[PDB]
Design a protein around this ligand. Structure first.
Ligand SMILES: COCCn1c(C(=O)O)cc2cc(C)cc(N3C[C@@H](C)n4c(c(CCCOc5cc(C)c(Cl)c(C)c5)c5ccc(Cl)c(-c6c(C)nn(C)c6C)c54)C3=O)c21
Length: 150
């Protein structure tokens, strides 16, 4: 319903902005405040996650050997495997998206900007499908911004 659309808007905006390598502060949609604040939080926490896990991110990127949109279509399986284990929390969700931004920068490097939208959708699809009930219990992105945004 609303949860998918809002998630996709947040994730797509962050991956896109990360790939161009400058912030975009165009406002969001109707639920403008929450989505804006979630995006600001992703910039802060997400950028730190990428720095912290530079090595593992780099090693994993290399093993994924991404070239084109067909590869992008084939990322979902490893993504699901690595994320749908065990504990759910917002830090883990930021880690999933942060790895998404890391790949999106690579896609830019190899002139595969067309793939960034499919990537974001694939991330959103996995997030909302596997964690729907938990996300609803937290009041979704409101729960994220309420407690994590500074
Ligand atoms: C130890 O953690 C087990 C899993 N886990 C549990 C739990 O209970 O299982 C709780 C918990 C809490 C947090 C905050 C984080 C983790 N992690 C820590 C590690 C295991 N991770 C996690 C993620 C996020 C989920 C997948 O995102 C993806 C996103 C995209 C766009 C693609 Cl295309 C793909 C293929 C994957 C990682 C992403 C990349 C790497 Cl490179 C590592 C990564 C790092 C870093 N080091 N190494 C060796 C790898 C392989 C990742 C994760 O969710 C947690």
């Amino acid at each position: 319903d609303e949860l998918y659309r809002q998630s996709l808007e947040i994730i797509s905006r962050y991956l896109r902005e990360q790939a161009t390598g400058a912030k975009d502060t165009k406002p969001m949609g109707r639920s403008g405040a929450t989505s804006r604040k979630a995006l600001e939080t992703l910039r802060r926490v997400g950028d730190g996650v990428q720095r912290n896990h530079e090595t593992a991110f780099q090693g994993m990127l290399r093993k994924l050997d991404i070239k084109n949109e067909d590869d992008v279509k084939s990322l979902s399986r490893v993504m699901i495997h690595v994320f749908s284990d065990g504990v759910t929390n917002w830090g883990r969700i930021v880690t999933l998206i942060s790895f998404g931004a890391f790949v999106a920068k690579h896609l830019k490097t190899i002139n595969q900007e067309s793939c960034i939208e499919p990537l974001a959708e694939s991330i959103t699809d996995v997030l909302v499908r596997t964690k729907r009930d938990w996300l609803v219990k937290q009041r979704g992105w409101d729960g994220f911004v309420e407690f994590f945004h500074v």
